[PDB]
């Protein structure tokens, strides 16, 4: 499960939103208004998806493997950029691995959903064709499938 | 177990209601949901229709793809953009055989002829697809392609936000029940929910509703019950919400007995697809035997299924189960021998495949990489243990459980259109109510690309439905208020009975969400073919399950909640319990064992193509509290041969 | 899971030490302990010896008899005070056959020739024994008698208190380790512990130490993991403390592979003894089949064990296992048919036995009666499900795991005297250290009466040892100070690393007690023939368990505790881990399956009377951190024939 | 597990010691010094032995069956006396059973541990006889057991 490092956490300074609390798919991250520091409210419901870890601008969140099967000492630390993401995997025995993978080939927020698509029409609404088809499929026509004789 | 730091209680009458009127309402902003939002925004312009997307968390990372994915499991490739081209006929054949003969081929062939386009768009939007020096999509197996998918959801999420507009996306709003047309008992009119960030009750009025809540997990007790209870292979975020509200609305379910048992790396449940298909890894028992070899003969009884290529996934699982029962564990994924073989002495080549190996985990299930790190397991030196997890219920992966939905007019045979009042692609038996992704049953193997695709298909159909039928659903305000009271009843019950005990979680007049869940899981695990009985069950076990579920269902009326988070947890439980009952009733109804490896009816141990080569469809009547079952014979829609 | 309301932290250096000097130290105030205190108090007068009893809880209700018991399982009856008289030879035979041919007959006959006297005293002290109109003790089966035993422990507690004196009884003090003689590496010198009510470190200096801590429970994952993780058939209070400190001291263990799997009422784990022996209740599978009969053929291979009467307990379990493996559950205890048949139409007779039925649960395992009430189960109308629970490690019941102990001079053969430096009854291989009840291995079926009796035996032997050998060990202050530091280390570790995380129970530098226990339970359940694999295991699984236990043992050095309660939980965990390691190494050493029904080694499925009809004795050398094993051939000591 | 009724618990503040805290075999019952009321500190470690329930002079403790398998509504209530104990078993469906069993045939605190026993002697210390033997066993002579030839 995830956990917040008090020394690095700043309850998300003056930003408009609390990154960890905003991103968690299971509503686990929340703010302790008293300490002004975040924490996982229900760790046994953590999927260890690392979403919070990646979105914490202070890098104040890490993941400690579930106690049921995880010996202490292991860690996976991500450093997500815009076109790639870096990972450092540290083994219980001190072994340290470093990787870097691409995550996007285009600028963030640059998607034009129907770029080049023709306008929809009432006639087309009645066909089997979806937006951009059959062009986006890459075929010379709408894919045909042989019906059982 | 949940221990809230402080209370956050509200009585129903103190909670403000927010009414949202729209034409198309999409419940669930995951992959199928975003697919629906994207496509719907396109055709909606024809009628100036309003499209709304409601999500309980944040779309940017919500659902099964929160960590990303290492591959796109469904890409036919009809032109040759990848290392391997396929035909649609071979795909349909593949899926039906994998289902041991039962799949709605009209539905499968339909998403299959649309899926590639979706994949091409994903790449247009920024998804990095592994490519060969020649520029081809790198194949994993025959139907999948590798991807650098860490940001797979954020990217698809952006497409949906750009398409429908952020003002039409409601996040942190949990939908717990559908609303039906006051004017028509078999038509949808919207849905109700509440915010998990503030005291606010939502009433969504809509002409068309699309269920995209994902499947259901945590119905069964996992192999880890402590913190790791949260380490379910499938999305722990999906709790069968769609199944619950749709079935409560009267929409018929299909193949709900068809659960999926995933064989994955032990405990962390990392993926095995790439290891098996891409790295050519072998799985051997504790004595070094490659059981797919030693157990091949046992598949001879499942002709022609057992003689199909690839071998049906359930039959692969069956081979594993035989090893487990003979006590030949641990079962190992010999990654060390795979890497050496593949590298062939070339150290630089080894480094390259070694990075690819870890990316396969770091791009979709980090826990597995963390598990190796914590246990000092170096994939190039030692093998890893693999094992089948507890059952999960969904319709987009290898499981085909979900609502019985209508197919395209140009593919759906007369035999399959009978239960639909209106014939609109992906519409349920309930008018105006559509089901996609995990929610749509009888057409599995959609995965990421296929789920998004099905969402597109339903969205266009919803627009067509609206413009052609011109519905004008009226919600029943009397029912809405009843639902509002029910929505926060758990909080009011807590306040009313907490004084009976000095401990908040040990009370005789109520159970907390985590307490009801543990009970649900124990019941399903011990009676509905869970890990406890090595996925075995029988009429008696199942009947006892219904008895225990009935007790639990009654106690749901005594659920309590100490804050908004737990209130969501309460309803997530309610959703799971009904999904559980449906699954049990379906398993009890089908008298055969068609998918050994997923579950066994020891009282009906054989596969029966004489009497059960049919889809089992059911409907729940809330007014009468009665379940009615029906058998729809399977008919081959597409041309193909074993 | 544990969430302390508030902290209660102390550093070793700030905790005051209380030194207690005594001659005889009894660790554990349960049934065997109270028996040892009682008897010791009698003989101690010969030398004005001091006797000290230390209990972690409160003797009034501590241990396995906290709820009371519905019967006394061991009463020979040599004169005819019960409905059935028996002979000692018949009893020794009975026990050896039940243990599948392995039992220290010198120890078994020894307690059996003394037990009746203990029972008679129990009645003299106020224990209400069921009696017939003629005044005879009502028999349950052949060796047990029915008792109204709700206050069974409080009564035995009063006797022990009157005998030893309250000022010699230390309650709420947890003993976590033994102290050895500074000048003799194989002699005990005392023990160390701490209060769980205040900050106080105890140092007991003694000439003789008697291990009476009961067995070990919770090593394996139970059939219920939520709140019901607390519902173990055997005493959840016993966590193998004696096993740990004794083995750490170098005292040899025996038959530690011989666990005990009890067949009980499902979930509540109520007793089945009275139902089988007194009410003539039948157990049947889901299809009304009486498996003790339908599975009779499967026992024929065991000779002569399979033909013994009654059928050995493990083989009785084996028959149910076969039913479970075939998936013929639920298994039912047909109480309804048992009561009807016993009453014979007489309604007044029915009411009488109906009350007796409920007393059987309300007198020793209320949870079962509560389960019946919550599930609306009326024993006269419907049957109850039964199932085998998870493994437990103890030597007083049907299992014989414990320390290798010396027997009486007149019965112990030279073959069994070899490993003892001093031949005192019940003394371990470590001079001055005795073991009783669950702590003494190779002599089972003691139960309540037998354990108290074995305590009396060791107590007298202990006084004789002191007066004859005039022991005078000296503790090592350097070690004591190291142990004191270790004692509170968890609390100090918590304070030192808690600031690494905003959450107390999610820290990268330590594990809390409940966290380590969940892990231990998962390891044992999945690799040490737990419920997860239907009590099956093999060399590979066992070797992997040792590797995982090694990881866990290392992490014990990183345990954290937030209060005294959790500090005790911390050491209870430590105690379980080592106990579990011994169990695993013992099962790995024995290459046969002598107790199918308790566990199966799939790689050595047969019983081997040619090379394994021996006691497996091991020793752990702390200084070398090495385990050594040896086989002590069984020899029949008492005259009897099959 | 056990749970305390606030309305009935007076924290034993009119007694020399806290009954529940004193009796619990697993050290679960403790006092919340704030409320001056008892509570089970670790319910999932409760064996449901009913010791606390039986010893609470205010009858403030009861047991709510483990949630894992217990439907709401059931209860077993004891009323422990000096010579007997009364039980009321209440079913979820409303059925109520009542029972009464003996628990002791002698007055509490009346045990004379070695009544009638002769004094121990050095000679007796070397035999196999325990206190009161061989007569407490019911035989005039110490029981013999045939050793195998
Ligand atoms: C989990 C997982 C893993 C681990 C792996 C994998 C997978 C998974 N795959 C598959 C995919 O992902 C699928 O198919 C998809 O995603 C499906 O979709 P859907 O159906 O749509 O679902 P999701 O996404 O999950 O979503 C849902 C949503 O909804 C929501 N909700 C719920 N409930 C509710 C809501 N909202 C409001 N209200 C309510 N009540 C959630 O939250 C979300 O967001 C795959 N695939 C591909 O392609 N590839 C790969 O790789 C994969 N993987 S494997 O192969 O390995 O197996
Ligand atoms: C549990 C149970 C039930 C439920 C039932 C029954 C039984 C049980 N049984 C049996 C008896 O009980 C036995 O055997 C006896 O008890 C044993 O003894 P011992 O070993 O001694 O013991 P216990 O008691 O448990 O005790 C112990 C003690 O110790 C302590 N500790 C621990 N740890 C520690 C301590 N202290 C200090 N430190 C440390 N560390 C505890 O706390 C206690 O006190 C039986 N029997 C008869 O007889 N009868 C009947 O009925 C019975 N039951 S059955 O039948 O079923 O079987
Ligand atoms: S996102 Fe990071 S800095 Fe902001 S509240 Fe969460 S953990 Fe603290
Ligand atoms: S790792 Fe994922 S599931 Fe866990 S708290 Fe963070 S974001 Fe939520
Ligand atoms: S014994 Fe009863 S009155 Fe006394 S503290 Fe405990 S619960 Fe409260
Ligand atoms: S029921 Fe027994 S174990 Fe539970 S708290 Fe009360 S005394 Fe303690």
CA distance D45 to B534: 28
Q: DSSP of C177-198, one letter per residue?
A: EEEE-TT-TTBEEEEEEEESSS
CATH number of the CATH domain containing C176: 3.50.50.60
Domain A67-149 annotated CATH 3.40.1440.10: no
Query: From the CB of residue C553, how many other CB atoms can be counted at a distance below 10 Å?
Result: 16
Degrees (nearest 5) of the Cα angle B597, B598, B599? 95
Residue D19: its chain C contacts at CB < 8 A? none
Active site residue B603: no
The closest alpha carbon to C235, from C360, C393, C443, C126, belongs to: C393
Q: Which helix (H) or strand (E) holds C339?
A: helix C335-343
Within-domain flag for B559: yes
Residue B507: its chain D contacts at CB < 8 A? 3, 64
- What CATH number labels A1-66? 3.30.70.20
Q: Can you read off the two tokens belonging to residue C96?
A: 């050896």
Contact B363 A111 (CB under 8 A): no
Asked if C212 and C243 touch (Cβ cutoff 8 Å), the reply is no
CA C614 to chain centre: 22
Q: How many CA atoms lie within 13 A of C511 on its CB side?
A: 32
Q: DSSP of C27-38, one letter per residue?
A: E--SHHHHHHHH
Classify C528 as helix, strand or coil: coil
For B522, B534, D72, the CA distances from B548, given in Å and listed in that order, are 10, 20, 12
User: Which of D50, D72, D119 is facing C366, going by the closest CB pair?
Assistant: D50
Within-domain flag for C133: yes
3-state helix, strand, coil in chain C (%, to 5): 40, 15, 45
Active site residue B448: yes
Please give the radius of gyration of chain D, using alpha carbons only, rounded to the nearest integer: 23
CATH number of the CATH domain containing C545: 1.20.58.100
Classify C417 as helix, strand or coil: helix
Phi, psi for residue A98 in degrees, rounded to 5: -130, 130
Helices marked H in B473-591 — which ranges?
477-497, 513-527, 539-556, 564-589
Contact A136 B117 (CB under 8 A): yes
Within-domain flag for B111: yes
CA distance A66 to A47: 10
CA D81 to chain centre: 12
CA distance C305 to C303: 5
Does the beta carbon of B454 sit less than 6 angstroms from any atom of ligand 1?
no
Within-domain flag for C447: yes
Asked whether the bond before C523 is cis by omega within 30 degrees of 0, the reply is no
Start-to-end CA distance of chain B, whole Å, equals: 49
User: Which of A4, A69, A72 is facing C501, going by the closest CB pair?
Assistant: A4
Q: Are residues C440 and C491 in the same domain?
A: no
Q: Is C519 on the interface with A (CB under 8 A)?
A: yes
Asked whether the bond before C485 is cis by omega within 30 degrees of 0, the reply is no
Q: Are residues C253 and C265 in the same domain?
A: no
Phi, psi for residue C15 in degrees, rounded to 5: -90, 130
CA distance A119 to A114: 9
Q: What is the dihedral of CA D123, D124, D125, D127, to 10 degrees?
A: 110
Q: DSSP of chain A, one letter per residue?
A: -EEE-TTT--S--SSSS-HHHHH-TTS-EEEETTTTEEEES-GGG-----HHHHH-TT--EEE---TTTPPTT-EEEEEE-SSEEEEEEE-TTS-EEEEEEE--SS-TT---TTTTPPPP-HHHHTSSPPTTTTGGGTSSSSPP-PBP-
Q: Can you read off the two tokens belonging to residue A73?
A: 């000492």
Q: Which helix (H) or strand (E) holds C566?
A: helix C564-589
Please give the radius of gyration of chain B, using alpha carbons only, rounded to the nearest integer: 24
CA distance A112 to chain C (A): 42
Query: From the CB of residue C104, how many other CB atoms can be counted at a distance below 10 Å?
Result: 32
Does the beta carbon of A52 sit less than 6 angstroms from any atom of ligand 4?
yes
Start-to-end CA distance of chain A, whole Å, equals: 55
Asked if D76 and C91 touch (Cβ cutoff 8 Å), the reply is no
Contact C536 B327 (CB under 8 A): yes
Active site residues of C: 73, 140, 233, 264, 360, 397, 448
CA distance A109 to chain B (A): 7
Asked if B134 and B150 touch (Cβ cutoff 8 Å), the reply is no
Q: Which atom of ligand 4 is nearest to the CA of B236?
A: 3
User: Which of B56, B121, B374 is facing A136, going by the closest CB pair?
Assistant: B121
Q: Are residues C555 and C432 in the same domain?
A: no
Does the beta carbon of B367 sit less than 6 angstroms from any atom of ligand 1?
no
Active site residue B641: no
Residue C366: give the domain boundaries. Answer: 261-392
Contact B538 C600 (CB under 8 A): no
Ligand 2 neighbours (beta carbon < 6 A): C 27-33, 54-57, 62-65, 69-73, 174-175, 212-214, 233-235, 237-238, 241, 271, 273, 364-365, 396-397, 437-438, 447-449, 451
Q: DSSP of B261-300, one letter per residue?
A: --EEETTT----HIIIIIS---EE-TTS--HHHHTSGGGG
Q: Is D76 on the interface with B (CB under 8 A)?
A: no
Does the beta carbon of A58 sit less than 6 angstroms from any atom of ligand 3?
yes
Does the beta carbon of B364 sit less than 6 angstroms from any atom of ligand 1?
yes
Within-domain flag for C1: no
Helices marked H in B307-346 — which ranges?
313-325, 335-343
Within-domain flag for C15: yes
Largest alpha-carbon pair distance within chain A? 71
Residue B502: its chain D contacts at CB < 8 A? 3-6, 9, 32, 35, 37-39
Sign of torsion over alpha carbons D122, D124, D125, D127: positive
CA distance D52 to D60: 9
Q: If contacts are CB pairs under 8 Å, which of residues 586-625 in chain B contact chain A?
A: none
Q: Are residues C563 and C496 in the same domain?
A: yes
Length of chain D: 149
Distance A55 CA to ligand 4 centre (A): 11
Q: Is B325 on the interface with D (CB under 8 A)?
A: no
Contact B501 D3 (CB under 8 A): yes
Nearest-CA residue of chain A relative to C515? Answer: A67
Ramachandran category for residue C200: left, alpha or beta (phi over 0 → left; psi -120 to 50 → alpha): beta
CA distance B442 to C479: 69
- The residues of chain A that CATH labels 3.30.70.20 are 1-66
CA distance B377 to chain A (A): 8
Asked if C98 and C313 touch (Cβ cutoff 8 Å), the reply is yes
Within-domain flag for B3: no
Phi, psi for residue C482 in degrees, rounded to 5: -70, -40
- The residues of chain D that CATH labels 6.20.260.10 are 67-149
For B24, B31, B179, the CA distances from B209, given in Å and listed in that order, are 6, 16, 10
The closest alpha carbon to C379, from C418, C343, C416, belongs to: C343
Asked if B329 and B266 touch (Cβ cutoff 8 Å), the reply is no
Contact D91 C376 (CB under 8 A): yes
The closest alpha carbon to C110, from C87, C92, C85, belongs to: C92
Within-domain flag for C207: yes
Distance B64 CA to ligand 1 centre (A): 3
Ligand 5 neighbours (beta carbon < 6 A): D 4, 9-12, 18-20, 38, 56, 58, 60-61
Which ligand is in closest contact with the Cα of B235?
Answer: 1
Cβ-Cβ contacts under 8 Å for B56 (sequence gap 6 or more): A27, B28, B62, B171, B172, B173, B174, B175, B196, B237, B568
For A104, B52, B196, B614, the CA distances from B608, given in Å and listed in that order, are 49, 45, 47, 10
Q: Which of D31, D43, D64 to mutate to test the interface with B (most CBs of B within 10 A)?
A: D64
Q: Chain B to chain C, count of Cβ pairs less than 8 Å apart?
A: 82
User: Which of B392, B420, B435 is the last residue before a domain boundary?
Assistant: B392
Residue B510: its chain D contacts at CB < 8 A? 72
Q: Are residues C421 and C322 in the same domain?
A: no
Exposure class string for C230-269: b at 16+ Cβ within 10 A, else e:
bbbbbbbbbbbbbbbbbbebbbbbbbbbbbbbbbbbbbbb
Count helices and strands in chain D by DSSP H and E runs: 3, 7
Q: DSSP of C269-300, one letter per residue?
A: ----HHHHHTS---EE-TTS--HHHHTSGGGT
Method: X-ray
Q: Which helix (H) or strand (E) holds C449?
A: helix C447-469
The closest alpha carbon to C320, from C392, C386, C400, C390, belongs to: C386
CA distance C624 to chain D (A): 35
Active site residue B125: no
Structural domain count of chain B: 3
Q: Are residues B116 and B204 in the same domain?
A: yes
User: Which of B114, B374, B408 is facing A70, going by the closest CB pair?
Assistant: B374
Going edge to edge, which strands form the sheet with C201-205? C17-21, C201-205, C188-195, C173-180
Sign of torsion over alpha carbons B368, B372, B374, B375: positive
For B314, B460, C365, C614, the CA distances from C64, given in Å and listed in that order, are 46, 68, 11, 30
The closest alpha carbon to A143, from C231, B211, B89, belongs to: B89
CA distance B84 to B585: 42
Classify B388 as helix, strand or coil: strand
Query: From the CB of residue B523, how many other CB atoms can be counted at a distance below 10 Å?
Result: 27
Does the beta carbon of A19 sit less than 6 angstroms from any atom of ligand 4?
no
Q: Can you read off the two tokens belonging to residue C329?
A: 């559950």
CA distance B599 to B590: 12
CA distance D29 to chain C (A): 11
User: Which of B392, B411, B431 is the last residue before a domain boundary?
Assistant: B392
Asked if B139 and B82 touch (Cβ cutoff 8 Å), the reply is yes
Cβ-Cβ contacts under 8 Å for B297 (sequence gap 6 or more): none
Q: Which of A8, A42, A47, A91 is catalytic?
A: A47
Nearest-CA residue of chain D relative to B526? Answer: D69
- Experimental resolution (Å): 2.5
Nearest-CA residue of chain D relative to B500? Answer: D5
Nearest-CA residue of chain C relative to B227? Answer: C515
Does the beta carbon of D40 sit less than 6 angstroms from any atom of ligand 6?
yes
Does the beta carbon of A30 sit less than 6 angstroms from any atom of ligand 3?
no
Can chain A be said to touch chain D, i.e. do they have 3 or more Cβ pairs within 8 angstroms?
no
Q: Can you read off the two tokens belonging to residue B111?
A: 């998403």
CATH number of the CATH domain containing C341: 3.90.700.10
Q: How many CA atoms lie within 13 A of B314 on its CB side?
A: 29
Q: Which helix (H) or strand (E) holds B370?
A: helix B366-375
Q: Are residues C362 and C399 in the same domain?
A: no
Q: Which of B264, B426, B445, B586 is catalytic?
A: B264
Asked if C233 and C392 touch (Cβ cutoff 8 Å), the reply is yes
Nearest-CA residue of chain C relative to A71? Answer: C551
The closest alpha carbon to B576, from B521, B504, B625, B508, belongs to: B521
Residue D104: its chain C contacts at CB < 8 A? 126-128, 151, 155
Classify C439 as helix, strand or coil: helix
């Amino acid at each position: 499960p995830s956990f917040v490092n008090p020394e690095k956490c700043d309850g998300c300074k003056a930003l408009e939103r609390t990154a960890c609390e905003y991103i968690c798919p299971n509503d686990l991250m929340t703010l302790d208004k008293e300490k002004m520091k975040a924490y996982n409210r229900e760790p046994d419901m953590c999927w260890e998806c690392y979403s919070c870890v990646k979105m914490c601008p202070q890098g104040a969140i890490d993941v400690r493997g579930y106690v049921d099967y995880s010996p202490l000492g292991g860690a996976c630390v991500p450093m997500r950029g815009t076109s790639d993401i870096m990972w450092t995997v540290k083994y219980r025995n001190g072994k340290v691995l470093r990787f870097k993978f691409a995550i996007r080939t285009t600028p963030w927020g640059s998607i034009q959903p129907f770029e080049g698509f023709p306008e929809p029409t009432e006639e087309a609404l009645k066909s089997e064709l979806l937006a951009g088809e059959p062009e986006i499929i890459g075929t010379s026509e709408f894919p045909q499938v042989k019906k059982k004789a | 177990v949940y221990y809230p730091k402080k209370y956050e209680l509200y009585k129903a009458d103190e909670v403000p209601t927010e009414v949202v009127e729209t034409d198309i309402l999409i419940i669930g902003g995951g992959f199928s949901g975003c697919g629906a939002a994207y496509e719907a925004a396109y055709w909606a312009k024809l009628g100036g229709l309003k499209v709304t997307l409601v999500e309980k968390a944040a779309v940017e990372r919500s659902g099964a793809v929160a960590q990303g994915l290492s591959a796109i499991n469904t890409y036919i490739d009809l032109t040759g953009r990848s290392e391997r081209q396929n035909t649609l006929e071979d795909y349909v054949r593949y899926v039906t055989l994998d289902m041991m003969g039962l799949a709605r081929e009209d539905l499968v062939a339909d998403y299959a002829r649309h899926v590639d386009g979706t994949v091409h768009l994903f790449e247009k939007w920024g998804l990095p697809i592994w490519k060969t020096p020649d520029g081809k999509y790198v194949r994993e197996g025959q139907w999948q392609i590798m991807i650098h998918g860490e940001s797979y959801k954020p990217i698809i999420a952006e497409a949906a936000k750009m398409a429908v507009g952020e003002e039409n996306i409601y996040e942190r709003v949990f939908i717990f029940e559908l609303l039906k047309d006051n004017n028509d008992p078999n038509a949808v009119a919207g849905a109700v929910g509440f915010s998990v960030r503030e005291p606010k009750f939502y009433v969504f009025k809509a002409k068309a509703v699309i269920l995209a809540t994902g499947g259901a997990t945590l119905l069964f007790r996992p192999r880890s019950t402590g913190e790791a209870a949260g380490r379910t292979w499938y999305a722990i975020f999906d709790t069968g919400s769609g199944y619950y509200m749709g079935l409560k609305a009267g929409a018929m379910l299909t193949q709900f007995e068809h659960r999926f048992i995933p064989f994955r790396f032990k405990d962390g449940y990392g993926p095995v697809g790439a290891w098996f298909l891409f790295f050519k890894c072998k799985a051997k028992n504790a004595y070094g035997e490659e059981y797919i070899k030693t157990r091949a003969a046992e598949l001879e009884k499942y002709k022609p299924y057992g003689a199909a290529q690839p071998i049906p996934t359930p039959l692969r699982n069956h081979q594993v189960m035989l090893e487990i029962m003979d006590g030949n564990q641990p079962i190992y994924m010999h990654t060390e021998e795979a890497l050496a073989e593949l590298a062939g002495g070339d150290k630089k080549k080894l480094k390259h495949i070694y990075e690819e190996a870890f990316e396969d985990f770091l791009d979709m299930t980090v826990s597995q990489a963390l598990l190796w790190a914590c246990q000092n397991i170096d994939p190039q030196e030692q093998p890893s243990e693999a094992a089948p997890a507890e059952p999960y219920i969904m319709g987009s992966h290898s499981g085909e459980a979900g609502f019985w939905v209508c197919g395209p007019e140009d593919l759906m045979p007369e035999e399959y259109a009978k239960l639909f009042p209106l014939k609109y692609n992906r519409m349920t038996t309930v008018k105006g109510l559509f089901a996609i992704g995990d929610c749509a049953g009888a057409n599995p193997h959609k995965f990421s690309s296929g789920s998004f695709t099905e969402g597109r298909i339903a969205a266009k159909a919803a627009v067509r439905f609206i413009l052609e039928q011109k519905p004008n659903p009226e919600i029943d305000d009397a029912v809405v208020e009843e639902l509002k009271k029910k929505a926060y009843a758990p909080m009011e019950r807590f306040m009313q009975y907490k004084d009976l005990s000095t401990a908040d979680d040990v009370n005789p007049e109520y159970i907390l969400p985590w307490q009801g869940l543990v009970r649900l899981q124990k019941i399903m695990d011990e009676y509905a073919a869970g890990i406890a009985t090595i996925y075995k069950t029988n009429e008696k076990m199942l009947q006892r399950a219904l008895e225990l579920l009935a007790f639990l269902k009654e106690d749901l009326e005594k659920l309590a909640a100490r804050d908004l988070h737990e209130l969501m947890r309460a309803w997530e439980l309610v959703h799971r319990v009904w999904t559980a009952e449906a699954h049990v009733r379906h398993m009890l109804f089908r008298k055969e064992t068609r998918w050994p490896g997923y579950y066994y009816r020891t009282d009906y141990p054989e596969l029966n193509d004489e009497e059960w080569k049919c889809f089992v469809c059911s409907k729940y009547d809330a007014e009468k509290d009665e379940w009615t079952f029906e058998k729809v014979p399977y008919v081959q829609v597409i041309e193909w041969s074993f």
